[PDB]
């Protein structure tokens, strides 16, 4: 997160930290006691599927305070339409091996209904983005959870307000832009998979996933987020499904 602030301990209680061999991989969002939503691209280079850990109640990476809860990731479900090394359909649904225990520091974010998300949530201008990613472009990652408030843009306006680049991916209906073109505030690579959380009438909801962009808080470029509202039915149907052998599962989308 570039140009944000420290999320006070327990204020982003749905934030997930994904680890592979004890190293920082990505972020994620807890949606209930056993399921985590993250980005499909976080798993593009994974070879050891059995060393994937999700940490809930995390805040400061340098110290163990006792509120952290670690769980093995039993399953990583990716849509059939997602192609590794590309940007479209950037979403993963993670099943934890054992449920986490809800506490003041571990709370799920609401996965909203599609209609509510499209009709109401998509019109809330500002939303929070969080993670332990890069504090600057080509800079060090954060030791404490960082949070940034970003405004959402209509795709036409994002394309009109952006500096044109070669081989730059298209902004599909499975994505949305959010952030600033002035190079001061963005989510970045280490924040990938993390939540884009929207407040509505006293409750927070999952509207986006940190997905991609140019560089990191690059002038003339906005952050691109997976548009979670396209995946509600897909996510809900999978959460009602029985676990399958093997970590990675590709599931038909739609």
């Amino acid at each position: 997160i570039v140009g944000g602030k420290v999320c006070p301990k327990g204020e982003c209680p749905w934030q997930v930290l994904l680890l592979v061999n004890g190293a920082q991989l990505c972020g994620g969002t807890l949606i209930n006691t056993i399921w985590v939503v993250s980005a499909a691209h976080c798993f593009d280079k994974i070879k050891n599927w059995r060393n994937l850990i999700a940490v809930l109640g995390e805040h400061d990476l340098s110290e163990h305070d006792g509120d952290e809860q670690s769980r093995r990731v039993a399953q990583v479900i990716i849509p059939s339409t997602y192609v590794p090394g590309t940007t479209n359909h950037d979403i993963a649904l993670l099943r934890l091996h054992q449920p986490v225990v809800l506490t003041d520091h571990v709370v799920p974010l609401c996965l909203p209904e599609r209609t509510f998300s499209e009709r109401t949530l998509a019109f809330v201008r500002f939303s929070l983005v969080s993670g332990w990613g890069q504090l600057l472009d080509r800079g060090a990652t954060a030791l404490e959870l960082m949070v940034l408030n970003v405004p959402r843009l209509m795709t036409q306006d994002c394309l009109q307000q952006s500096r044109k680049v070669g081989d730059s991916p298209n902004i599909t209906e499975y994505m949305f832009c959010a952030g600033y073109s002035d190079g001061s505030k963005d989510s970045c690579k280490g924040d990938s998979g993390g939540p884009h959380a929207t407040h509505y009438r006293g409750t927070w909801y999952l509207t986006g996933i940190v997905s991609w962009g140019q560089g990191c808080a690059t002038v003339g470029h906005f952050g691109v987020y997976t548009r979670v509202s396209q995946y509600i039915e897909w996510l809900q149907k999978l959460m009602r499904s029985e676990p399958r052998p093997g970590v990675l599962l590709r599931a038909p989308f739609p």
Partner: protein
């Protein structure tokens, strides 16, 4: 009705027989008698920050 201002609902809105509307809540919440408001039924409902709620 749901199309405009969330049909007055705090959370989810379902349209019915023309002029009818039903508000609904996410699990861990129940709808109040006003027919729009959602109240938590559990200790840790989704989308609420306990440290802020207890403050």
């Amino acid at each position: 009705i749901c199309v405009n201002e969330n049909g007055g609902c705090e959370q989810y809105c379902s349209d019915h027989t023309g002029t009818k509307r039903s508000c609904r809540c996410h699990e861990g919440y129940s709808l109040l008698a006003d027919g729009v408001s959602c109240t938590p039924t559990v200790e840790y409902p989704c989308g609420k920050i306990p440290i802020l709620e207890k403050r």
